[PDB]
């Protein structure tokens, strides 16, 4: 009577479709997904140091907008800028705003050392009702509004040598008065000038008198500029008027720090990968949640889904 | 498909085999059975796990990069920032599509390979005591109870012991 | 006597050479080409909206050079700039010419709404023989040359709020007179000034008196600048002289629009892919016709040709 | 070449077979014939068409990009614009070269695979009535007229009917 | 591994074969021998050299590019210059990893392929005078001195000459 | 007694580990390395034309710093800038220093043709002790320091037409005096002005009086600018003071030329590929020596090593 011996393989009733070189739909017994396409909806506060900007932009924390006084000297791995943030100090603009935001974001610290500049000849500590600290007229914490003293504004000439091992980041400004009377009242001269320089570079700004669309009580503006002083170099500030002076320097590092725009809430969880949509798991090699990521993340791709066959071809009975 | 076994000269799989990927189904005088082969099942699974380990959680750490959303019209510099990023995404999208296509074609071929290897392992074991029926089944020309089937699966089958009996049945007239 | 049964495969006398992993020349029975390397020589006017610039650059159509008056308010999917184009109005230059060209090209429309600015105090509608409309002295259609009125040029101060849902693109200029007498004759003051600003930004230009290489009758120049006003924002223009004022704004969209340099003629045909050499078919995945493309195109590669085997290895008898 | 049939133990192809890619050539007492096998020919063609469909007309839509020709010397920004584009072209050029190399190697291997599959299909069909001559030809040890050849090609050949006759010729002395 | 010969039904390689990659080891009445097969050894070597020639010294000429080290903080433009370069390096790093992975998997499979081809070449040559023992060795059922072994290696072995003798030993009882 | 015939393959006692699709460590009989990871330590002076900057930056050779006089009119395939280089002439800065360095590096030549400018009205050939040639007060070889003549500095107006087939590169400057007395002594007017222009462009610079950190005897500065004049175009220079004038133009080509920072010594050898670490062989397709290369080089990758299997799997006895 003999015997028969049959060689075979398994199969399933619920196979999965995958793509190959020769076929864009072939059924295998099992597959796994390679594109992360969902987020938790919240930014995990671990393992990275998250700084929730809340009502404050990074720039406004840097300058020292009064409602941003809490951010002084903080560090961060990732600074999260909310869309609800607002400015509530003296109206300003920043030539190359983007570059200043990126270099500070990249540096990852708001550490600020104060320095004693010799402003003999001018009054200091000018204030305004557009910038209040507990109802009292005030100004940017890190900036010093210099104005006339007994109706005189001499030619200022002040030096600050960097004798440290690190770079110094100096933030300074220029007042653009709305009216000629405002110019002469504040700075006496008919038009000011500001020159901040080092051994290697120079920046000279001529103020522009004239009103600007009214913003929060003011029709003048302050333009913001920055200067990096290397070790062995010297900061040289000159002014015949309109100088918004720095009160010191910021440390400027290089690290793994950055800044992200997102309104995703912060949660108590652990996740290496951060998107503006919230944290995502990094178990898969690809993701199409967001082209903006931070940390150990799957790489962004256009595809919804990419199924990797984990089993043989499926041939049901 | 590259060896023609799975979805080839084997008409379909066995939905009832749930302890392995490849196996045996026999019929003799004592009855009918089904048992999974481990060495070939483990061989396919280990290869597929090897692929997964080369892909799962091997990610890239990136920190400060470039901006990728913009609120103002700016022109030349913004165009290049968008172009750089759009170029990068297309290239990684291509890498992703080809990767999955290549891996899946190979996964199908290596599972077909492992099926054929088991078929060939059995065929050489049975020597001149059996004949390939062409559909993944061997006709065994001798009395082969369950202990005899077990020796084939286990790899302990002495073909010499049954050669005379099978040769007589194979070449009868 | 028996029989013999032979298994075999086909072959051809005219095989093709292809590359593999292990061999850069192996003969197969048939192959297909994957690199598009020829063009039709003409740009197909379908399915995309083609705007043949002819004698006009995009900028000159934007500004309203008289021989470009026909392009007013036109839209486009692809604007084609010919090398034969010329400027035939008042000589000008544009700081960041490239960015202005790209943003307008990208926006894809020359739509222009006129707006009533209060220029009380100055004469309007200045003209020149370098910019003629039907033999008559004229100027850029979209620009308004303001000059003195009864030998006086007061401090202009005009506002234009954007209360619409869309962005407004304003194009404006500054006259740089050749001579000091030309300055005082046109604008009375010894030197002018122009400040266009919004709530978020400002641009202040001081004119420069002095001749420039003679171009088409003139040795002075007009510098061209632009300003984008967001919804809820306000355009503020100030001048004590030399302001070339806008007569309104351009709509500024985002779309699939762009601009290409080519002297390939326009034809009546249908082709998705456009190169400066002309349209090419997009049936192949690669092309080496031009690195500059528009539309659904094969991707540029350095290779002349890439042969994909469509048949087995060829072994002739 | 991976199965050693095409440009291997088959010395050359048949320029005269023009209705298929794989086929049969027989000689018996009634004469000599040639007929193409469809299932293996269709199997190779369908796979190659599958490749083509994954490549042909799947293109990318791009609109406003960056400038790629320049009339002035500009320096830093122009260098980066040229670099970005030169980098992109080299990467897609590489993708194109590898794609064609990989696909062609696989096209040669899968056509070799399909040849072997047909050879193996026939070999199991003929059971113990035939012997592999080593050059892609089987020696059939019995009377096999054209209707007998046709049953082999068609897959209707009952080997039992000729077994006694072939076994006698195979094992004669 | 895709054919199951190397590191499969062949238990190990021969460290003593130093004139070839594939070969023969025989035992008969005159003694025991070892000789390398050239056509299969040359076939594997030529394929691997083909790979190398497609990779070795095919490099890219680049001249003026972008700066890639920086002494000052600059922001937006420097970020994009770093990003462009970091993106390029990651993509070529990926191309390099996949290239080596793909090539190595194929090199292992093609060397396994060439082993199987030699095994199959020999098996068809021996016709019904021998039987596959299952471990890459054939049992030859007749007197086969060294000149007889040499004819097998050389491809001059007339199986007809020994068929009667082998058939008698194969089907004895 | 019969016979047995065994088919087999070779093996080795010293196999190599390689990666595959399914396995990151599998032993093969032999492998070859694909990542070049070592350099010779020296830059080969062949087959490329290497210019060792030694003590001179490219810019200082361009301008004509006295200790850089040897580099006049030299060409190069690769200019090598040493970290020991120093400036030893009048202190200067360059707006867009990087772009000027790149365009000259790319052009690959310091060829300089002199041109006869009509500076009637001013004294020429101003010198300084910060820039000495053989102990004698001198200046940049390619620049002409114009100052007053008999206490008068008229409005200069000089033209130079490009009637050649090639582009002309003009390098010029602006003096920023430390003191107002220095300004009036040198240039008579209370503040200067410089306008260099062509038919297509213009650059106007207002000098800034005021001291700068002391560098090598001087507290004033010279700002460096450049202008490219096309064929058929005309160079137009105007000055009412502080103009540092060019003595001619540089030829500006396009070629395979570039510039590299490295302190690797130059050697007598032949090597196509140059890195800042020194030349490397280009036999391998990849390298991780440096992301900065010049010539026919392996492509940079992050990986130390990538082993290509050149033999079968190894299974020892
Ligand atoms: C210093 C001062 O009080 N300036 C005000 C100016 O006073 C002139 C006076 O100095 C001059 O000698 O004589 C004339 C005629 O007699 C003036 O009286 O007058 C301007 C117009 O009336 C004022 O502008 C008004 O300022 C308001 C609030 O101003 C503050 C502010 O809160 O922003 C007060 C601050 O202390 C002051 N800062 C400093 C450092 O002194 C600032 C600053 O002057 C401006 O913000 C800069 O433009 O002003 C309202 O904002 C009101 O809308 C505005 O008209 C001058 O304040
Ligand atoms: C407004 C005017 O006519 N200006 C011309 C100027 O007239 C001076 C006069 O205004 C002043 O009070 O007294 C002195 C001495 O008595 C002058 O007479 O004189 C210049 C030199 O002679 C002229 O320059 C000549 O302009 C020519 C053609 O000029 C136009 C033009 O077609 O471009 C006429 C236009 O109407 C005018 N635009 C406006 C808004 O009035 C322009 C414009 O002034 C200039 O284009 C700006 O530079 O000029 C030729 O171009 C000739 O080559 C040139 O010397 C003043 O036109
Ligand atoms: C032209 C000249 O000699 N200027 C010096 C200036 O002389 C003034 C005089 O011209 C005026 O009429 O009357 C007053 C009062 O009587 C002055 O005497 O005085 C300055 C301050 O004393 C000098 O500055 C000193 O310059 C030193 C060396 O100067 C040179 C140099 O080697 O750099 C000499 C060069 O010939 C000169 N260049 C030209 C084209 O004439 C330059 C140039 O003036 C400056 O470098 C630009 O700032 O100066 C030392 O550097 C010393 O430290 C410094 O105080 C004027 O040199
Ligand atoms: C389809 O194929 C997929 C992919 O091959 C396959 O999914 C895998 O299943 C394994 C085993 O079930 C999963 O392994 C688990 O992974 C988690 C971490 O993610 C571990 O913590 C788990 O550990 C438990 O088991 C261990 C056994 O040794 C213990 O040591 C441990 O203490 C825990 O008890 C567990 O190993 C693996 O995560 C998935 N992989 C993926 C990518 O999903 C799946 O089984 C297949 N589908 C079907 C229906 O068969
Ligand atoms: C070498 O290989 C190539 C690629 O495999 C092969 O070329 C292909 O041939 C097919 C069939 O001849 C072509 O198909 C045609 O495509 C056009 C559109 O481009 C269709 O419009 C045609 O349709 C006609 O036939 C249809 C049959 O069903 C009808 O439905 C229809 O109404 C028309 O009558 C036709 O299908 C295909 O375009 C090419 N592909 C390429 C990439 O060239 C070629 O045959 C091989 N060479 C040799 C010498 O054998
Ligand atoms: C591991 O595999 C590698 C790669 O396959 C293998 O290395 C290769 O060996 C060959 C032959 O020994 C080397 O070829 C040499 O190359 C140099 C140039 O680099 C030539 O100048 C040499 O020429 C001599 O020999 C020629 C023979 O025809 C003569 O014509 C000539 O005049 C010279 O006498 C020589 O051909 C090759 O360089 C390496 N390749 C690499 C990438 O290293 C190696 O053999 C394997 N390892 C082991 C231990 O087996
Ligand atoms: C130049 O023109 C601008 C625009 O008209 C002038 O600014 C305008 O100034 C008036 C008052 O001088 C503003 O009205 C004020 O509005 C606030 C809140 O909206 C209100 O609380 C005040 O009581 C007052 O009514 C007007 O809004 C403002 N416009 C803008 C856009 O800011 C500017 O003063 C003019 N300059 C000169 C020198 O004429
Ligand atoms: C400063 O120098 C420039 C260059 O010399 C002066 O411009 C030149 O001015 C003269 C006339 O004043 C031009 O000649 C004219 O040419 C046209 C056509 O070519 C001709 O039709 C006229 O009749 C006249 O002859 C000369 O070409 C022109 N040069 C350039 C390059 O434009 C400029 O006027 C000088 N400025 C001062 C204040 O001196
Ligand atoms: C504005 O302030 C700066 C900074 O104090 C002034 O520059 C300084 O000027 C003095 C002399 O006037 C310099 O001293 C000199 O140093 C050299 C070598 O170091 C020495 O050989 C000389 O004999 C002299 O002692 C001082 O170093 C210098 N500081 C810097 C940073 O350059 C500048 O003069 C002031 N301007 C005005 C108008 O007050
Ligand atoms: C993650 O957030 C992004 C950004 O908001 C989402 O992408 C946008 O989706 C809107 C509509 O849903 C589109 O119109 C935009 O074009 C998208 N933005 C960009 C930059 O492309 C994305 O859908 C979110 N994904 C998940 C999974 O939450
Ligand atoms: C399509 O047009 C381009 C651009 O003109 C051609 O490429 C140029 O060819 C010239 C000489 O023929 C070369 O010197 C240039 O280097 C090329 N330009 C660039 C930017 O590389 C191209 O040959 C044309 N191709 C077809 C098929 O018409
Ligand atoms: C070649 O030179 C480069 C540049 O100096 C070396 O890379 C640097 O190595 C230091 C420490 O050795 C690291 O801290 C830097 O991050 C590296 N630079 C960059 C830009 O990444 C490199 O090690 C040298 N390689 C050889 C083989 O000499
Ligand atoms: C085969 O192995 C199984 C598993 O241990 C065992 O139960 C069975 O008895 C074995 N049979 C033979 C015939 O060796
Ligand atoms: C374009 O310019 C040329 C020469 O100026 C002229 O012949 C042609 O008619 C012009 N075409 C248009 C549409 O203006
Ligand atoms: C085989 O099939 C062909 C096609 O229909 C038919 O003409 C022929 O008669 C068949 N022969 C046999 C033996 O079945
Ligand atoms: C096989 O070939 C070798 C090499 O030429 C030769 O020495 C040997 O005699 C040959 N043997 C036979 C049996 O052909």
- Do F255 and F276 belong together in one domain? no
Residue B14 tokens read as: 């066995």
CA distance C183 to C207: 10
Last residue of a domain, one of C259, C284, C308: C259
Instruction: Please tell me if residue C303 touches chain E, with a CB cutoff of 8 Å.
Output: no
Considering the domain architecture, whether residues C108 and C187 belong to the same structural domain is answered as yes
Number of domains in chain C: 2
Q: Is residue A265 part of a domain?
A: no
Ligand 16 pocket residues where CB is under 6 Å: E 147, 150-151, 154, 156
How far apart, in Å, are the Cα atoms of D76 and each of B77, F97, F103, F256?
A: 12, 10, 8, 17
Q: State which residues form the domain around C146.
A: 49-259
Q: How far is CA E67 from the centre of its chain?
A: 45
Which residue among B17, B50, B52 is best mutated to probe the pocket of ligand 4, counting the most ligand atoms within 8 A of its Cβ? B52
Q: Cβ distance F304 to F37 under 8 Å?
A: yes
Burial of C204 (0-12, 13-18, 19+ CB in 10 A): middle
Structure-solving method: X-ray
Question: Could you tell me if C106 and C72 are in contact, meaning their C-beta atoms sit under 8 angstroms apart?
Answer: no
Helix A97-107 / helix E76-126 crossing angle, nearest 10 deg: 60
Partner-chain residue, chosen from B72, B77, B79, that has the shortest CB–CB distance to C228 = B72
Chain E residue nearest residue B84, CA to CA: E84
Q: Which of A176, A211, A213 sits opposite C198 (nearest CB)?
A: A213
Cα C40 versus chain centre, distance: 24
Neighbour-count burial of E118, counting CB atoms closer than 10 A to its CB (0-12 exposed, 13-18 middle, 19+ buried): buried
Whether residue C264 is contained in a domain is answered as no
Please indicate, yes or no, if residue C148 is contained in any of the structural domains: yes
Contact yes or no for F199 and C208 at CB 8 A: no
Phi-psi region of C235 (alpha: psi -120 to 50; beta: other; left: phi over 0): beta
For the CA of E52, the nearest atom of ligand 6: 5
| Residue A127 Cα distances to A61, A64, A124, A130, angstroms | 18, 13, 9, 9
In a 13 Å sphere around the CA of B65, the CA atoms on its Cβ side amount to 20
- Pairing relationship of beta strands A168-176 and A243-246 according to DSSP bridges: antiparallel
Atom 27 (ligand 11): residue with closest C-alpha?
Answer: C289
Asked whether residue F94 falls in the same domain as residue F66, the answer is yes
Tokens representing B28 are: 């003799």
DSSP state of A71: G
Structure tokens at F257: 């030329």
Interface test with C, best of F21, F155, F200, F205 (most C CBs within 10 A): F200
Last residue of a domain, one of C213, C229, C259: C259
CA distances from A280 to A34, A40, C317, F138 (A): 13, 6, 61, 66
**Is the domain of C132 the same as that of C234?**
yes
Is the CB of residue F284 less than 8 Å away from at least one CB of chain E? yes
Dihedral over alpha carbons F295, F300, F304, F305 (to 10 degrees):
-80
What whole-number distance in Å separates Cα of residue E138 and Cα of residue F269? 59
Please calculate the CA angle B58-B59-B63 and round it to the nearest 5 degrees. 150
DSSP C314: P
Cβ atoms C50, C272 nearer than 8 A? no
Q: Report in angstroms the alpha-carbon separations of D9 from C243, C317, E117.
A: 88, 14, 9
- B56 phi and psi angles, rounded to 5 deg: -70, 135
CATH number at residue F179: 3.90.209.20
Residue E108's CB is within 10 A of a number of other CB atoms, namely 25
Please state the atom number of ligand 3 nearest to the C-alpha of residue F218: 51
Q: Is C23's CB within 8 Å of E50's CB?
A: yes
User: Please, which residues bridge with residue F284 across strands?
Assistant: none
- Shared domain for A210 and A294, answered yes or no, is no
Partners of residue A197 on adjacent β-strands: A202, A236
From residue C299, how far is each of D90, D92, F189, F211, F303 by CA, in Å? 11, 8, 61, 57, 29
- Are B121 and E101 a contacting pair at CB < 8 A? no
Q: Are C94 and C273 in contact (CB under 8 A)?
A: no
Where helices occur in chain B by DSSP H, the ranges are 38-55, 76-126, 146-154, 160-170
Q: Are C242 and C313 in the same domain?
A: no
Query: How far apart are alpha carbons C231 and C244 in whole angstroms?
Result: 24
The rounded distance, in Å, linking the Cα atoms of C265 and C44 is 9
Mark whether C19 and C136 lie in a shared domain. no
Token match 């913001």: residue? Answer: A224
E-chain CB neighbours of F299 within 8 Å are 59-60, 92, 96
Is C266 domain-assigned? no
**Does residue A57 lie within any of the structural domains?**
yes
Helices (H), C188-310: none
Asked if residue E164 lies in contact with residue D173, where contact means CB atoms within 8 angstroms, the answer is yes
Shared domain for A159 and A280, answered yes or no, is: no
Q: Is E54 on the interface with D (CB under 8 A)?
A: yes
Resolution value in angstroms: 2.6
Q: How far apart are CA F30 and CA C246, in angstroms?
A: 75
* CB contact residues (below 8 A), chain F span 128-157, against chain C: 157
Joined tokens for residue A58: 């990074």
Task: Concatenate the DSSP letters of all residues of A88-126 into one string.
Answer: -SS-EE-TTHHHHHHHHHHHTB--EEE------SSB---
- For residue B96, count other CB atoms closer than 10 A to its CB: 22
Looking at the DSSP bridge assignments, the partners of residue A313 are A28
d(CA B103, CA F256): 41
| Residue F313: CATH number of its domain | 2.10.77.10
Choose which residue among C16, C30, C33 to substitute to test ligand 5 binding: the one with the highest number of ligand atoms within 8 A of its C-beta. C30
> Would residue C62 count as lying in a domain?
yes
On whether the CB atoms of residues A252 and A102 are closer than 8 A, the answer is no
Q: Do A210 and C234 touch (CB under 8 A)?
A: no
Query: Distance between CA atoms of C100 and F179, rounded to whole angstroms?
Result: 41
Whether A194 maps to a domain, the answer reads yes
**Residues C296, C235 share a domain:** no
F155 CA: nearest ligand 8 atom: 38
CA dihedral F35, F38, F40, F46 (to 10 degrees): 20
CB F238 to CB C212 under 8 A?
A: no
The answer to the question of residue C265 being in a domain is: no
The answer for residues whose C-beta is within 8 angstroms of residue B49's C-beta and 6 or more apart is: none
Query: Which residues on neighbouring strands pair with residue A51, listed in sequence order?
Result: A79
A214 CA distance to ligand 7 centroid (A)?
A: 7
How many residues comprise chain E? 173
Pairing between β-strand C258-261 and β-strand C78-81 as defined by DSSP bridges = parallel
Shared-domain flag, residues F187 and F284 = no
User: Does C286 contact D at CB distance below 8 Å?
Assistant: yes
Structure tokens at E4: 């199951």
Among A230, A259, A288, residue at a domain's last position: A259
* Rounded CA separation A76/A80 (Å): 10
Phi, psi dihedrals of residue D45, rounded to the nearest 5°: -65, -40
Q: For ligand 15, atom 14, which residue shows the shortest CA distance?
A: D151
Question: Are residues C100 and B75, on separate chains, in Cβ contact within 8 Å?
Answer: yes
Q: Report the C-alpha gap between D162 and D142 in whole angstroms.
A: 7
Tell me the CA end-to-end span of chain E in Å, nearest whole number: 38
Report the gap between the CA of C280 and the closest CA in chain F (Å): 31
Those residues of chain D whose CB sits closer than 8 Å to some CB in chain F are 72-77, 79
Q: Which of E10, E26, E100 would best serve as a mutation to test chain F binding (most F beta carbons within 10 A)?
A: E100
Closest CB to B73 among C96, C98, C252: C252
Q: Are residues A291 and A166 in the same domain?
A: no
Cβ contact B43:A35 at 8 Å: no
List the structure tokens of C9. 């495969």
The 3 state secondary structure assigned to chain E is CCCCHHHHHCCCCECCCCCCCEEEEEECCCCEEEEEEHHHHHHHHHHHHHHHHHHCCCCEEECCCCCCCCCCCCCHHHHHHHHHHHHHHHHHHHHHHHHHHHHHHHHHHHHHHHHHHHHHHHHHHHCCCEEECCCCEEEECCCCCHHHHHHHHHCCCCCHHHHHHHHHHHCCC
What does the alpha-carbon distance between residue F208 and residue A136 come to, in Å, rounded to a whole number? 39
User: Does one domain contain both F72 and F195?
Assistant: yes
Six token digits for residue C113? 């709404």
């Amino acid at each position: 009577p003999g015997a028969t011996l049959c060689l075979g393989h398994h199969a399933v009733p619920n196979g999965t479709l995958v793509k190959t070189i020769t076929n864009d739909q072939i059924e295998v017994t099992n597959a796994t997904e390679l594109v992360q396409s969902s987020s938790t909806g919240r930014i995990c506060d671990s393992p990275h140091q998250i700084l929730d900007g809340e009502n404050c932009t990074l720039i406004d924390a840097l300058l020292g907008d009064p409602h941003c006084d809490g951010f002084q000297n903080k560090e961060w791995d990732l600074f999260v800028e909310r869309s609800k943030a607002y400015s509530n100090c003296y109206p300003y603009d920043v030539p190359d705003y983007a570059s200043l935001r990126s270099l500070v974001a990249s540096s990852g610290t708001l550490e600020f050392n104060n320095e004693s500049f010799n402003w003999t000849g001018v009054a200091q500590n000018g204030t305004s009702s557009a910038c209040k600290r507990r109802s009292i007229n005030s100004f940017f914490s890190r900036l010093n509004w210099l104005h006339q003293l007994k109706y005189r504004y001499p030619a200022l000439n002040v030096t600050m040598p960097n004798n440290d091992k690190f770079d110094k980041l100096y933030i300074w400004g220029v007042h653009h008065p709305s009216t000629d009377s405002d110019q002469t009242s504040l700075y006496t001269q008919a038009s000011g000038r500001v020159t901040v320089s080092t051994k290697r570079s120079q920046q000279t700004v001529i103020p522009n008198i004239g009103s600007r669309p009214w913003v929060r009580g003011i029709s003048s503006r302050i333009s913001i500029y920055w200067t990096i002083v290397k070790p062995g170099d010297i900061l040289l500030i000159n002014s015949t008027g309109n100088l918004i002076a720095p009160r010191g320097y910021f440390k400027i590092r290089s690290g793994k720090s950055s800044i992200m725009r997102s309104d995703a809430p912060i949660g108590k969880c652990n996740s290496e990968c951060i998107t503006p949509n919230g944290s995502i798991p990094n178990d898969k090699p690809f993701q199409n949640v967001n082209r903006i990521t931070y940390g150990a993340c799957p790489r962004y791709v256009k595809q919804n889904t990419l199924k990797l066959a984990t089993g043989m071809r499926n041939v049901p009975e | 498909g590259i060896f023609g076994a799975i979805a080839g000269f084997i008409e379909n799989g066995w939905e009832g085999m749930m302890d392995g990927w490849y196996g045996f189904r026999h019929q003799n005088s004592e009855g009918t059975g089904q048992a999974a082969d481990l060495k070939s099942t483990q061989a396919a699974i280990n290869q597929i796990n090897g692929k997964l380990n080369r892909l799962i959680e091997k990610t890239n750490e990136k920190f400060h990069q470039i901006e990728k959303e913009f609120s103002e019209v700016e022109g030349r510099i913004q165009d290049l920032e968008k172009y750089v990023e759009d170029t990068k995404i297309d290239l990684w999208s291509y890498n992703a599509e080809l990767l999955v296509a290549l891996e899946n074609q190979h996964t199908i071929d290596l599972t077909d390979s492992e099926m054929n290897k088991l078929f060939e392992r059995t065929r050489k074991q049975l020597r001149e005591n059996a004949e390939d029926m062409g559909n993944g089944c061997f006709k065994i020309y001798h009395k082969c109870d369950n202990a005899c089937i077990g020796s084939i699966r286990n790899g302990t089958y002495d073909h010499d012991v049954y050669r005379d009996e099978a040769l007589n049945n194979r070449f009868q007239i």
